[PDB]
Write a protein that binds this ligand. Sequence first.
Ligand SMILES: N=C(N)c1cccc(-n2nc(C(F)(F)F)cc2C(=O)Nc2ccc(-n3cnc4ccccc43)cc2F)c1
Lengths: 235, 97
Amino acid sequence: IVGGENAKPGQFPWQVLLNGKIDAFCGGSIINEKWVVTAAHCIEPGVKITVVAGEYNTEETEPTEQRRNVIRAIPHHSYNATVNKYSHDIALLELDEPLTLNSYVTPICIADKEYTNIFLKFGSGYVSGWGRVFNRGRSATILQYLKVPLVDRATCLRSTKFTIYSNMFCAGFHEGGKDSCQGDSGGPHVTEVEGTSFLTGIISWGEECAVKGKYGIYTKVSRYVNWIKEKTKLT
Amino acid sequence: QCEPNPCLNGGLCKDDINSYECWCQVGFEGKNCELDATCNIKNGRCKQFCKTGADSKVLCSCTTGYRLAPDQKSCKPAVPFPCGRVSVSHSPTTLTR
Ligand SMILES: N=C(N)c1cccc(-n2nc(C(F)(F)F)cc2C(=O)Nc2ccc(-n3cnc4ccccc43)cc2F)c1
């Protein structure tokens, strides 16, 4: 995460790191011990992916790590029909063997339609991940995090080429200099209300990273939330 | 202060020297626990989710994993490792200094 600060161990326990063809390729958020969740545009024909749970410094080997291999990988009933493939940038990876839940492996909270938006509209969220440290160049070995103020629809439209529909929302810095990035893709965007952090975004795309004038943009989980609620019901 | 209880609807009067308040309860709002509580007046006084209901009276509640305590506002973890809390910097009784 460019413009972030180092995260600290044990403090981000929903931060799956999605491992496949390239190693460090997408982040993910433990929707719970048996399923983790991620942007749909990390689902490649051919790759076979591996959630790295309790990870801290990639250049080294932590006792909290719990890899699984994705036993199957749903994306939403409306990902892309060959059309605009970053809209409902969302998806669930069923892990094969259930993760042992602990203080380094802990699911983030998925608050219903009406409330996830409310948390989302408190206007600053903790974005995290191992992605690029600088704009094209250097990836974060030891988990990076960053706070992001919500940046309004009207303005963020004003920084685009592309179509920013409603299943996404924009956020980052007006004065360019810090954002998520490629390699952060799929990582979390959560807001904490008084301890309990809730997920309100999948970190998605962005006309480049942390580029003064252009922002990075995120998925609007408000929408898919119920869907998430449905399909992970261990009960 | 508390002869008879100025806080009604069940609330509780911690009277003072000068003054007194009404520790209010659920369902209820305003000063002497007079008027109803509403999902827009301070979240409903629920700690996670405020809903309304058939009546216009409220209904607090929690995410999958937490359990609404018997006071009916605050949420208690209901499974060992609950959703979205950090747990290094709090066990057993520690705060991020
Ligand atoms: N700023 C962020 N938070 C962020 C997050 C993920 C990826 C990128 N990086 N990193 C890089 C880096 F490599 F340069 F570092 C490049 C990108 C990146 O996402 N390129 C990119 C991707 C998709 C589109 N696009 C825009 N609207 C669309 C509508 C439909 C389809 C694609 C659409 C335009 C783009 F610029 C940036």
